[PDB]
Design a protein around this ligand. Structure first.
Ligand SMILES: Cc1ncc(Cn2c(C)c(CCOP(=O)(O)OP(=O)(O)O)sc2=O)c(N)n1
Ligand SMILES: Cc1ncc(Cn2c(C)c(CCOP(=O)(O)OP(=O)(O)O)sc2=O)c(N)n1
Ligand SMILES: Cc1ncc(Cn2c(C)c(CCOP(=O)(O)OP(=O)(O)O)sc2=O)c(N)n1
Ligand SMILES: [Mg+2]
Ligand SMILES: [Mg+2]
Ligand SMILES: [Mg+2]
Ligand SMILES: [Mg+2]
Lengths: 524, 524, 524
C-alpha cells in the first residue's frame, strides 16, 4: 500500500476521522482521494483552523487532527498553539513541506528548519527522513499528543512522500494502545489518604485537567467526603466543578498574596489538575501562610517541577481523583454552605452592564449550555452569575491569547451537537479570528456568539488606570459593525441595545436553526 | 534616565518615529508616556500589525518598529514573519514579557523560552538578562534588522524593565552608524566587468533586492549598455525593472527546466538581488544548459551558499548595481526583439475574466500606481498586462504566505501618500487578514482593494487538476459578502458584476477620498 | 539570606552533598565558602567530570550535581551528556555565566544563547531572568532531573547572582517532595495480569530502567512465577537480571530480524524498562512474527510513542514490577533450564583471547564486583562469561559514546565503596577520557582498569569487512603505552602479555588499596 493509504488506515484505526484544515499545494497529495469515512472542516485562516480543532479536542476529550500549509500556515496558527499548550490540548498538527528534491534549493513553500518553527509550543516536533517513515512518525505524533500530559505535536511531511510505497511492517502501528492512566502506588497513596483524613480544615483547589479527565463527579464526591470548600485555580481554562454545589467557592484571584490569604487557616490544601499556580497580576507576598501545607496532583512534570511550594504527585487526574474519592473517610464535620446568589445590579433602560447580560443568559440558556469566555474585563462576574452544573461547560483561552473563543465555540458545538454553545466575546477579541464565523455558517454549526461591545480594550484601559500610566495609545476600537461582519460570513445577526432587546434577541437566537451573532451594547 | 526614556531616545536618534502595534498588559509600561514625536498605528490582529509594518518598511526602504503582546501576539504574527524573512524586510519586532519576578512560576502571559519562539524566521532573537541591558539590546535589534541582508529581528522585554535605571553609558548607542554599503574589490570587479564586456549574448535576471535598494535605474542603464534581455527572477516579491522597457522579457516561470530553457544560448547570465532561484512547481531538468555561465550578486550569504550553480558575490545591491552600470562598455548589439502584446481575451457582458480586469486597471490607473498581488491564479497575466514603469510599484507575498497584501497595501499607502495603492486580492486570500481594513478606515489611508471573487481557491483547483487529484476537499469558499465585510470595518464598498460596472467602480474608487473596496465577480 | 546561602540549603535539604566539577572564573562565586557538609570532586576535563557524576548517579540511584565552566566546559561535556540522556541518568548540570552586566557585549566567557547549547540532550535547560529566581530554578532542575523518566538537566547562572539577596519565600522550596512513583490503575492492571496468566508461552525482556529502579528482584519473582524466559534488551546499558539464573537467556542481538526470530512462538512478550528496541545493525525483517503480541512497560513517553509495535504503559518501573510480581499467578509450566556454561577457548602462550580474560575475571573477581564495558568488539563474550548475581553490576555507554567507562567506573566506585569496580576498556576507547585516571589517584578511589590492547579499533575493522569496504583510513591505534599514561596520572600500573601474567596482575590488583591499571595484550 502507499504511504497515503497506510496513514489514513492508521488514523482511522486510532479513532481519528475528522481533519481540520486550510489547504495548500504541499497538502494536495495528502488530501487527494480523501476517504469517504473522513470529514474535512475548512476554516479560512489558520488561527481559526487550530482554534476550532482545539475546542473540538477539549470537548470530545480525544485528539484532533489538523492539516496546515507549510511555514506560513503553521506560523499563522502559532498564537492558537500557545493556548493549546497551556490547556494540554491533544492536537496533531501536520503541515505540508516541499517535495524532497526541492528542499535544498529552498524553493517557494519550503518550510526551513521545520521542526524548530513551532517550538517551544509543542511536545514533539518532527520531519521524517524518508517517505516510508511517515506512518511511523504519524504514530509517534498521535501517541505523543495523547499521553499525559496531553498537548500539541507537529509533523512536517514532504508532499512527494504520500504516493511512495509504505513499509508492510507499518501494519503493527494500527492497533497500538498506549496508556498513561496511572496513579500513586498503594503505600504512598495510603499515606496521602491518611493526611487528608487527619486534616482539621482541608480545602480543595481544582484546575482544567479535572474537566479534561471528566474527573468532576469524583471531585464532588471527594469534596463531600472531606466536607471541604472547593476553589477553581486562577486563570481557569475550564470549569471542573458544579458552580452551585454547596462546597463551591469560585474562581481564585490570580495573585500570590491573595491566594495565600484565601488559604489561611486551611491546614491541608489539595490541588488537583492545576499548575501551582497560574498567577497573573503582580501581587507579591507569601506563597502560603504558615500552618498551611499544600499537596498537588498534576499530570505534568513541568508543573510539578516549577511549583514554588508544596509536595507534588505526577499522575493521571482521572485515576487519582477516582482513587481518592473512594478511599477517603466521610468526615463528620458540617458540609459547607452554598454561596449566596449574586446581587442584581441596577439596570436602566440604556447600555447593558455585563452583570445583566450574565443574569439573563443564566435565566434563559438551557441547563446544559456550554459557555466560552473571551470578554476579559467581565470574567469574575461570569463565574459568579452562570450556574454550570455539568462538566465541559466553560472554556477560556488558557494562555490568555485572544482569538480562541470564537473558533473554539464552533469546535465545541461540533463536538456536542445537543448542547447549546454560547460564546461571550468582547468587541476587541472578536476581530482576532472573525473569519471563523464562515465555518459555522458553511457546516451548519449553530453556535451563538454574544459580542460585548463597549468600544474599547476594556481590561487594558482598566489596568492602565491601575498603573497610573498616562498617554497610552491603541486602547480604543470604535467603528466596528458586528452585524455587518456576520452578514459578510453568512451568519444571522441581531442587535441588543437594552435589556428588553437582549431578552428578545436571546429568545430568537435560542430558537434559530443556524448560528447567530448578537451584538450587545455594553457599558464602558 | 529610565530604560523607557533611554530607549525612546535611541529610537528617535536612529530614525524611528512610528510604532505599529496591538497592545497588551506586558506592553503598557512601554507604551505609557508615549512621546509626542512618535505615532502609533493600531491594527486588530498581529498578522495585520506585522503586514502593515512590512509594507511600510518595504516601500519606505527603512526599518519599521513593531510592538506585540507576549507569546500569543508574537505567535499570531509568525505567518507574516515568514514573508518578511523572504523579502529581507527590516522589521524590529518587540514583544512584552511578564515581570521578571513572575517568569519562573510561568504566570499567565509569560513568554516561555521567548527567543526560540520566532525562530527560524528571524535574523536575531533575544531576551536581555537585565533591565539596564534593554537599550543595548534594542540597539543590536535595530542594526541587525538594518544590515545587509536585511530582515526581521525579535526582542522580548519583561514589563518591569522599563521603569528601571538605564546605564548612563547607553548614550554611546544613540548616534552609532553602521554600514554594509559595500562592493567587490577593484581587482575582482574589473574581472567581472571584463567578462560582461566580453560576453557575446549576455542576459540579466533581477530580484527583489534590486527594488529594495532602489537600484532599478542603475539596472536599466546596465541593461541598455549591454543590450541585454532582462528577466525578473521567479516568485517575484517586488518589481525591479520597468515592465515595458525594450529590454524587459517578463517574469520567469518558477521551474528548473523552464528557466534553463529561457537562458539557453546566453553565454553569461548575470543575476542581481535574487535567490538562485526561487523555484516553486516541480519542473525537473537542467539548472543551466551547456554554454551558459551564471554570476550572482546577492546581499545574502545564505542565497550565495545554496545556489546550485554559478559564481556568487556577496555585496550591497545598490553599490554593486551602481558600479557595474557605470563601468561596463556600451555594446553596439541590437536590443532584444520587441515582446508581443497580450491578447484582448474574449469577454461577454457577464462575470469578468482576470485579463479583462488587468487590462482595465492598466488603462485607468495612474502611471505611478502601486500594485499588490494576492490573486494567486492570475499572477502571470498580471505581470503581462500592467505597465509598471517606476520603482516600488509591485508587492507579492515573498514566502507565498497569504494574508500579506491586504495589510501591506495599507502600510505601502501610508509610506507613499502621493501614489495610489491598488491591491488585487483573491476572495480566498482576502480573509486571512480581513480585519486590517479597520486600520485603513481609522487612519483614513486611501488604499483601493480589488477583490477578485470567483468563489474558490482557484490555483489549488488548477493544481488539483494537473495532479489528476480527485476528491480533494476544502477548495471552495462560497458565501462571502465582501461589501458587508468592508461595511463592518468602516470602508466604502462597491461591486462590479460586469465590465461596465468595473469601469464605473474604478472611476469612483479613484476619485474617493478614503479607502475603497471593490468586489469583482470573476469567472471560474 | 544570599542566593548562595539559600541555594546550598536547598541542595542539602534535597539530599545533595557532592559536587562534581572543573572550575572556572564564572564559577568561583558559587564555589566560594564551600560548605563543610559538601565534598567537591575535581576532574581535569569536563567529559570526565560528567562521566564520573554519571557513574555515581547510576549506582547511587539518586541525582548527581555538576558544576562546569560556561560554554566551553559545557561543550566539552556534551558527548558524555549523549550517554546520560540514553541511560536516563539524573544529572543536574550547572554552568557559570558571565556577570549580567557583561552578557550583552559578549565578553569572554559569555555563554551565548546558553539554554540552547545542550539541547537536544537534556530534559530541561534554562537561564534565570534574575538573581532571586536562581533558587527556584535550581529547585526546578533537581525535580526535572529526578522525575520519571529521569535525565540530565542544565542550569546557567550569571556569576554575580550568588551574592544577591534571595527571596525569603524561597524557603518553601527546601522540603518539597515530588513523586512519580505511579502504576497502572487497578482495572487496567487486572486486564494486564489476566493476559499474562492466560499466556501459553510468555517471554520477558528487561531494559536498563529495571536496574535503575532496583526492580531486579521483583523481575526475578515475576519470571519465576510465569516460568518465562528472560532476555536483556539490545545495546544494554545496565544488567537487570542475574545472568546465571535459570530463566536467563542473555543479551538480545540488536537487529530487527534477529529479535523477531528470537521471539517466534512466544504469544505474549512483556518488555519492562527498555526502549522497543535499541536496534543497532541493519537487519531488516519483521518487527514481530505472526502469533506474538508485545506489551511494553516504560517510564518514558518518548519510548512508548516510538515503539513500532505493541501496546505500552507509561509508569514507574519500580512500582509496576513490584505489582506485577505480586499479582500474577504461579504458572504450572516447567521452569526454564539454565543456559549451559560457555566453552573454554584454546589459549596458547601468547596474547590473550578476550574469552580467556573474561573467564579469568570471573574466577578471581569477588561475587559483588561491578563491571564496566567499553571494549566494543567483545561485548557478547562478556555477557556470556561473567556471572553477575547482583543489581548494579554492569554499565555500558548507553548512546555508544566512548569515553564513558573510565570516568564512570570512578563514579561507581565512589558510590559503592565496598564493591570492587573493574572497568574493561579497549585501547581505542581508553584515550577518550584518559585524564579521568587522575581523579582516581587523587581521591584514592580504588577502581581497577583493565585495558584490552589489540592496537586497533577492532569493531570498526570487523564492520569494515562485513561492509566489503576497503581503503578505509583511521582504524589503527598503534604506539600507546598505557602503563606510562597511568604513571602520568599517578595510578599503579601492571602489564599482562599472557595468561600467567594476567593471573598474577589481577591477583595483585585485587589486593591493592588504590586504583590499578592493567594493560593486557589481546589478540587482534
Ligand atoms: C493575541 C493577543 N493579542 C493581544 C492581547 C492583549 N490583550 C488585549 C488587547 C485585551 C483587550 C480585550 O478586549 P475585549 O473588548 O475583547 O474585552 P474587554 O473589553 O472586556 O477587555 S485583553 C489582552 O490580554 C492578547 N491577550 N492576545
Ligand atoms: C497562509 C496560507 N495559507 C494557505 C496557503 C495555500 N494557498 C491557498 C489556500 C491558495 C488559494 C488562494 O485563493 P484566492 O482566491 O486568493 O486566489 P485564486 O482563487 O486566484 O487562487 S494559493 C495558496 O498557496 C498559503 N499559500 N498561505
Ligand atoms: C565518542 C565516540 N567516537 C567514536 C565512536 C565510534 N567508535 C569507535 C571509534 C570504536 C572503536 C573502539 O575501539 P576499542 O579499542 O575501544 O574496542 P575494540 O578494539 O574492541 O573495538 S567503536 C565506535 O562506536 C564512538 N562510538 N564514540
Ligand atoms: Mg471591549
Ligand atoms: Mg520557533
Ligand atoms: Mg479565488
Ligand atoms: Mg582495540
Amino acid at each position: 500500500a502507499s504511504v497515503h493509504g497506510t496513514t489514513y488506515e492508521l488514523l482511522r484505526r486510532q479513532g481519528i476521522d475528522t481533519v481540520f484544515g486550510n489547504p495548500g499545494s504541499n497538502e494536495l497529495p495528502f488530501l487527494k482521494d480523501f476517504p469517504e469515512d473522513f470529514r474535512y472542516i475548512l476554516a479560512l485562516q489558520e488561527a481559526c483552523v487550530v482554534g476550532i480543532a482545539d475546542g473540538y479536542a477539549q470537548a470530545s476529550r480525544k485528539p484532533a487532527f489538523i492539516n496546515l500549509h507549510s511555514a506560513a500556515g503553521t506560523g499563522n496558527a502559532m498564537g492558537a498553539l500557545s493556548n493549546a499548550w497551556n490547556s494540554h490540548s491533544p492536537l496533531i498538527v501536520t503541515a505540508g513541506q516541499q517535495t524532497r528534491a526541492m528542499i535544498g534549493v529552498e524553493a517557494l513553500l519550503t518550510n526551513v528548519d521545520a521542526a524548530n518553527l513551532p517550538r517551544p509550543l509543542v511536545k514533539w516536533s518532527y520531519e521524517p527522513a524518508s517517505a516510508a517513515e511517515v506512518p511511523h512518525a504519524m504514530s509517534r505524533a498521535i501517541h505523543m499528543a495523547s499521553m499525559a500530559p496531553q498537548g500539541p505535536v507537529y509533523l512536517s511531511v514532504p508532499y512527494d512522500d504520500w504516493d511512495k510505497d509504505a513499509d508492510p511492517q507499518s501494519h503493527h502501528l494500527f492497533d497500538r494502545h498506549v496508556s498513561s492512566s496511572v496513579r500513586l502506588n498503594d503505600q504512598d497513596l495510603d499515606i496521602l489518604v491518611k493526611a487528608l483524613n487527619s486534616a482539621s480544615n482541608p480545602a480543595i483547589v481544582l484546575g482544567p485537567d479535572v474537566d479534561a479527565a471528566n474527573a468532576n463527579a469524583d471531585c464532588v464526591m471527594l469534596a463531600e467526603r472531606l466536607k471541604a470548600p472547593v476553589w477553581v485555580a486562577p486563570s481557569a481554562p475550564r470549569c471542573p466543578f458544579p458552580t452551585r454545589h454547596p462546597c463551591f467557592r469560585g474562581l481564585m484571584p490570580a495573585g500570590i498574596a491573595a491566594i495565600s490569604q484565601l488559604l489561611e487557616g486551611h491546614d491541608v490544601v489539595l490541588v488537583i489538575g492545576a499548575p501551582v499556580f497560574r498567577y497573573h497580576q503582580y501581587d507579591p507576598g507569601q506563597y502560603l501562610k504558615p500552618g498551611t501545607r499544600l499537596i498537588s496532583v498534576t499530570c505534568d512534570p513541568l508543573e510539578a517541577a516549577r511549583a514554588p511550594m508544596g509536595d507534588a504527585i505526577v499522575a493521571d487526574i482521572g485515576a487519582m481523583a477516582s482513587a481518592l474519592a473512594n478511599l477517603v473517610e466521610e468526615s463528620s464535620r458540617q458540609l459547607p454552605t452554598a454561596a449566596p446568589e449574586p446581587a442584581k445590579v441596577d439596570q436602566d433602560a440604556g447600555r447593558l452592564h455585563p452583570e445583566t447580560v450574565f443574569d439573563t443568559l443564566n435565566d434563559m440558556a438551557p441547563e446544559n449550555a456550554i459557555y466560552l469566555n473571551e470578554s476579559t474585563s467581565t470574567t469574575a462576574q461570569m463565574w459568579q452569575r452562570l450556574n454550570m452544573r455539568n462538566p465541559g461547560s466553560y472554556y477560556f483561552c488558557a494562555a490568555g491569547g485572544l482569538g480562541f473563543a470564537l473558533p473554539a465555540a464552533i469546535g465545541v458545538q461540533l463536538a456536542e451537537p445537543e448542547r447549546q454553545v454560547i460564546a461571550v466575546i468582547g468587541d476587541g477579541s472578536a476581530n482576532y479570528s472573525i473569519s471563523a464565523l464562515w465555518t459555522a455558517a458553511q457546516y451548519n454549526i449553530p453556535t451563538i456568539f454574544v459580542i460585548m461591545n463597549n468600544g474599547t480594550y476594556g481590561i487594558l484601559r482598566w489596568f492602565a488606570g491601575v498603573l497610573e500610566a498616562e498617554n497610552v495609545p491603541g486602547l480604543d476600537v470604535p467603528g466596528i459593525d458586528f452585524r455587518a461582519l456576520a452578514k459578510g460570513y453568512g451568519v444571522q445577526a441581531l442587535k441588543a441595545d437594552n435589556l428588553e432587546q437582549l431578552k428578545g434577541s436571546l429568545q430568537e437566537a435560542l430558537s434559530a436553526k443556524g448560528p447567530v451573532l448578537i451584538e450587545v451594547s455594553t457599558v464602558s
